[PDB]
Amino acid sequence: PLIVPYNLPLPGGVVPRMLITILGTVKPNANRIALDFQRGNDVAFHFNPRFNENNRRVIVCNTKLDNNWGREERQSVFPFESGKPFKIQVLVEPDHFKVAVNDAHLLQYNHRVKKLNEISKLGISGDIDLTSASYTMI
Ligand SMILES: COc1cccc(CO[C@H]2[C@@H](O)[C@@H](CO)O[C@@H](O[C@H]3[C@H](O)[C@@H](NC(=O)c4cccc(OC)c4)[C@H](NC(C)=O)O[C@@H]3CO)[C@@H]2O)c1
């Protein structure tokens, strides 16, 4: 019921206590998913599950500043499975984004972009059927 890629506006940016919830299902034979928290053309937080990087499943996280990718943060805990429904929750905390998948903590990503109130869009893309994308204050 949502079209991918999907853009979710984050009015006034993000702030600590904001909880973003994404519900969807991974397609069969998926190759990738991506969440991109944007500050204009900059990517404050890219969260990128990769289903076949050299026959390994990995989650890659990074920031893009002035069109340049920085230092990648990689996690080999990989909770996604092709064909299966998922829930991604991203909780903004003071020093990091905190990510849980299917109610299990996955990773944290330290704020590199510091102007949280300018991170005003979330792009959701990749090999998913997207069911809902929303936010609340915790
Ligand atoms: C595929 O469709 C897309 C649509 C829209 C946007 C994007 C963006 O993809 C980009 C984004 O995910 C970025 C995050 O760091 O990594 C880019 O890929 C990176 C490799 O991950 C990055 N790969 C690795 O470092 C690597 C590979 C295997 C194991 C390992 O362990 C440390 C590391 C590669 N680095 C080098 C030196 O080639 O440089 C590429 C270009 O910057 C993606 O092209 C892709």
Which among 69, 76, 78 is the best mutation to test ligand 1's pocket, defined by most ligand atoms within 8 Å of the CB? 69
Helix, strand, coil abundance in the chain, percent, nearest 5: 0, 60, 35
Q: Can you tell me the distance from the alpha carbon of 80 to that of 40, in angstroms, rounded to the nearest whole number?
A: 29
Cβ contact 99:59 at 8 Å: no
The residue written with tokens 């944007």 in the block is 38
Name the method of structure determination: X-ray
- Residue whose CA lies nearest to ligand 1 atom number 18: 69
Resolution in A: 1.6
Q: Can you tell me the distance from the alpha carbon of 6 to that of 114, in angstroms, rounded to the nearest whole number?
A: 24
Q: Can you tell me the distance from the alpha carbon of 22 to that of 66, in angstroms, rounded to the nearest whole number?
A: 27
- Rounded to the nearest angstrom, the distance between the alpha carbon of 69 and the centre of ligand 1 is 9
* Domains of the chain listed by start with CATH number: 1-138 (2.60.120.200)
Q: Which two tokens stand for residue 92?
A: 């903004």
Angle 114-126-4 from CA coordinates, rounded to 5°: 90
The residue written with tokens 């053309």 in the block is 41
Beta-strand ranges (E) seen in 1-138 are 6-9, 18-26, 33-39, 42-53, 56-65, 68-69, 73-75, 85-92, 96-101, 104-110, 121-126, 128-137
